[PDB]
């Protein structure tokens, strides 16, 4: 019930004959109790390990849209190393 991380038309910068595609969708995740074996390599012993991939554009051309300013146009999408999760 949650969409594959694929390309999707962005109406706001997209304009007929000039469709702007953005990467967005779903990736696999996993969180479980930190295995003791690893709990020892830790400087700061957390307690819930988490494996998590996140939807990202793997190829993106840079184009310019109707209002002077230029945007990023996505050409492909692949679940990859997450970088903004951390909180």
């Amino acid at each position: 019930d949650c969409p594959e991380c694929t390309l999707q038309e962005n109406p706001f910068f997209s304009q007929p004959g000039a469709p702007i595609l953005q990467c967005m969708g779903c990736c696999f995740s996993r969180a479980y109790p930190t295995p003791l074996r690893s709990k020892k390599t830790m400087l700061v012993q957390k307690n819930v390990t988490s494996e998590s991939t996140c939807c990202v554009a793997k190829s993106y051309n840079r184009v310019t849209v109707m209002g002077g300013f230029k945007v990023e146009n996505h050409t492909a999408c692949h679940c990859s190393t997450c970088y903004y999760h951390k909180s």
Partner: antibody
Amino acid sequence: QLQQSGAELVKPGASVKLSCKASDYTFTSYWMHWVKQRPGQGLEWIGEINPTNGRTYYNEKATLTVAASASTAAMQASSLTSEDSAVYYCARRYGNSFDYWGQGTTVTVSS
Amino acid sequence: DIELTQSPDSLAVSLGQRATISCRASDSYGNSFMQWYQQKPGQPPKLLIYRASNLESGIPARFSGTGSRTDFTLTINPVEADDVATYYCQQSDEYPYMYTFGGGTKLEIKR
């Protein structure tokens, strides 16, 4: 050019149509979307149509259409009650804004 | 989740006078552009200035806007007899995709 045509009557029942004929150049290049304005109040967006692909962008019973040949959109309202039935304008989008607007259309209910 | 709320519901300024009619918006989520439209009794709206401060071709030197985040206004140096109408602000949003209006700061020029 942007010729939006609008009659207004029909009981609190099932289906009314609407149209926005247009001209002075190339329809297959700019968007297209209707806006509803109930009297003595501001208007609010209802739905877009990529006059190119023909795909729809509504908001949260308004199946909209377009004919590249007839050069015109078509807001089709169903379940015509009080909540419905006011002045319906057809507009264009030129850089994320709307530059041109049709003349207007009004469509009221009865008892 | 966007509540555009204009401040002056019915600005009572006379000829050749100050004009301010602010419109506020509903922290960070997606991109967005404000818009100021001029609709009058009888005729369809007319986009006045685009984006926040820029303006349209065919519209005077007078009409201007200023703002950046939540509170942007449409100022008028010399209010005249021809500029008789309600002014609607608008905000084109990014992902919570929708075009919304806030109502109108109907202008009435003093006898």
